[PDB]
């Protein structure tokens, strides 16, 4: 007999191992593999498709389609319209394609895209300042403070969608998915740059927002997702 030894870890069943198993039903011939359009090879390719953010998820809107847009108007003074804390566990991102893929993974490291679109008439125009306050920085609460971080300024005309690329600013190499105080991601605040001027006195505009991942986004340490529960028994 050839001398073999059974080290520790050799009569166990680890769910995430990679072993070969005896084929029950031998000689079995599976049906042929035909070309079905749309084949996917990587879930990050799902996490790179823009999906709307429920930016108006207040207690009266969840469950209604009106939780996907907020209403902007002509105000004399600048105001903070909207804040999106970069937390891939926050219900803003944790329900989109980006967030619902990233929540299966404990860590994520890359750059985000956020595409703002204004749905209003053809005569309404306006400028907005989309600022991203880097990690460690307080929520701006004044446009003079918000415009010091990574920001852009997008017009409104003949083209309605604009993209702020939240760059990868971090100390560590990976940012935890469940947002904590050590790896927090900062905030993305949307400010009236000059106004929103509609063609009438009380006109309104409805702003949407989608999120996706840049090609350099990565994830690691697959886990359970907190975005699914089972309390009952499926019968």
């Amino acid at each position: 007999g050839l001398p073999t030894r059974l080290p520790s870890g050799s009569q166990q069943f680890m769910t995430t191992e990679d072993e070969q198993s005896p084929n029950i039903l031998p000689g079995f011939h599976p049906s042929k593999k035909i070309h079905i359009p749309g084949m996917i090879t990587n879930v990050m390719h799902m996490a790179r498709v823009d999906s709307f953010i429920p930016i108006n998820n207040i207690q009266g809107e969840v469950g209604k389609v009106s939780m996907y847009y907020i209403t902007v108007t002509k105000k004399t003074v600048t105001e903070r319209i909207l804040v999106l804390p970069l937390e891939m566990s926050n219900t803003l991102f944790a329900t989109t394609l980006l967030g619902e893929v990233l929540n299966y993974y404990a860590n994520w490291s890359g750059s985000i895209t956020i595409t703002f679109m204004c749905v209003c008439d053809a005569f309404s125009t306006g400028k907005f300042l989309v600022a991203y306050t880097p990690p460690g920085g307080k929520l701006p609460e004044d446009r003079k403070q918000a415009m010091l971080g990574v920001h852009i300024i997008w017009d409104l005309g003949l083209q309605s969608s604009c993209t702020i690329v939240v760059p990868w600013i971090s100390s560590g190499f990976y940012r935890r998915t469940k947002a904590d105080s050590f790896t927090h991601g900062g905030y993305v605040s949307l400010w009236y740059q000059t106004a929103f001027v509609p063609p009438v006195s009380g006109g309104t505009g409805s702003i949407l927002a989608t999120c996706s991942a840049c090609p350099d986004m990565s994830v690691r340490m697959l886990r359970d997702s907190p975005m699914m529960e089972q309390k009952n028994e499926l019968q």
């Binding site: 769910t15 198993s21 005896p22 029950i24 039903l25 599976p30 049906s31 593999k33 079905i36 749309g38 084949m39 996917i40 090879t41 990587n42 879930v43 790179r48 998820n57 207040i58 809107e61 469950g63 939780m67 105001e79 903070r80 909207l82 804040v83 926050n90 219900t91 803003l92 944790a94 329900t95 394609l97 993974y105 490291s109 595409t115 679109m117 852009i152 083209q159 969608s161 604009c162 993209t163 690329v165 760059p167 990868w168 996706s212 840049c214 090609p215 350099d216 990565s218 690691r220 340490m221 697959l222 997702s225 975005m227 699914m228 529960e229 089972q230 309390k231 009952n232 499926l234 019968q235």
Partner: protein, 261 residues
């Protein structure tokens, strides 16, 4: 690996790589080199833990049974455990061999008979149908071993239907069955104990391998209610005089004020 970051100086361009269009149904290619001043960053992260093989190939739990009189039966399906049913309902069509492992706390000598579709299974232990000539069976002693065996892709099509928008009988029929229920059955496993020693809890861990997912979908955003049924309206209290109130059970949390979070 993921691509490196390229440097980018101050640019004054007349072709904005920022102003795209959400209406055209295409996502933006805007990398941070388009918005800010980047530095070259040798970036070597891989999404190797995200590809379908390593995403789904993890041998989750598919079903539990309980040996009542040294006998229990389970029809193979991923529809009972919501956590893995969601990861599957990510995609529309899936093609995979599966590797079944039985974690039983029983002690003694058990038998698993994989009953292919269309025949009668043993309705109890010490049934005559257990002496089979061709139904593949697995004997094992639970102490010293976890039984495991691969079922190749038994499809009757080029893939599995995770969602099926059709019926199996023509229009005027009466017992039409919506969904994927008729599209496929993977047989069933009949467990029995020949001894009397151990417990009755049997867990069936199934690992999809050689996966090939075909059409992405919006991941399920609501707790399930039934199997094969893709309903989501939960009827919580069938007894009380509110049975006609249907909870929703979604995962969208609300915040107190926008522009403050």
């Amino acid at each position: 690996v993921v691509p490196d970051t390229k440097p980018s100086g101050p640019q004054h361009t007349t072709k904005p790589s920022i102003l795209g269009a959400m209406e055209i149904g295409a996502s933006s290619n805007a990398t941070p080199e388009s918005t800010i001043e980047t530095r070259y960053v040798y970036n070597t992260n891989t999404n190797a833990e995200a590809d379908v093989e390593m995403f789904l190939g993890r041998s989750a739990l598919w079903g539990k049974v309980t040996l009542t009189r040294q006998y229990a039966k389970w029809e193979i399906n991923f529809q009972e455990q919501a956590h893995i049913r969601k990861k599957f309902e990510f995609f529309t069509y899936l093609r995979f061999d599966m590797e079944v492992t039985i974690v039983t706390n029983n002690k003694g000598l058990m038998q698993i008979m994989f009953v292919p579709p269309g025949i009668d299974h043993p309705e109890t232990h010490d049934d005559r149908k257990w002496d089979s000539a061709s139904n593949p069976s697995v004997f094992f002693q639970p102490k010293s071993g976890f039984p495991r065996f691969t079922i190749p892709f038994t499809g009757l099509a080029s893939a599995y239907y995770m969602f099926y928008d059709g019926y199996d009988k023509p229009k005027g029929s009466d017992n039409n069955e919506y969904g994927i229920a008729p599209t496929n059955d993977m047989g069933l496993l009949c467990f029995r104990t020949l001894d009397n020693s151990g417990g009755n809890d049997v867990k069936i861990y199934v690992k999809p391998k050689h996966i090939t997912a075909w059409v992405p979908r919006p991941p399920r955003a609501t707790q399930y209610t039934h199997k094969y049924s893709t309903n989501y309206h939960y009827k919580p209290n069938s007894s009380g005089p509110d049975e006609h109130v249907l909870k929703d059970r979604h995962f969208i949390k609300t915040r107190p004020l926008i522009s403050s979070a």
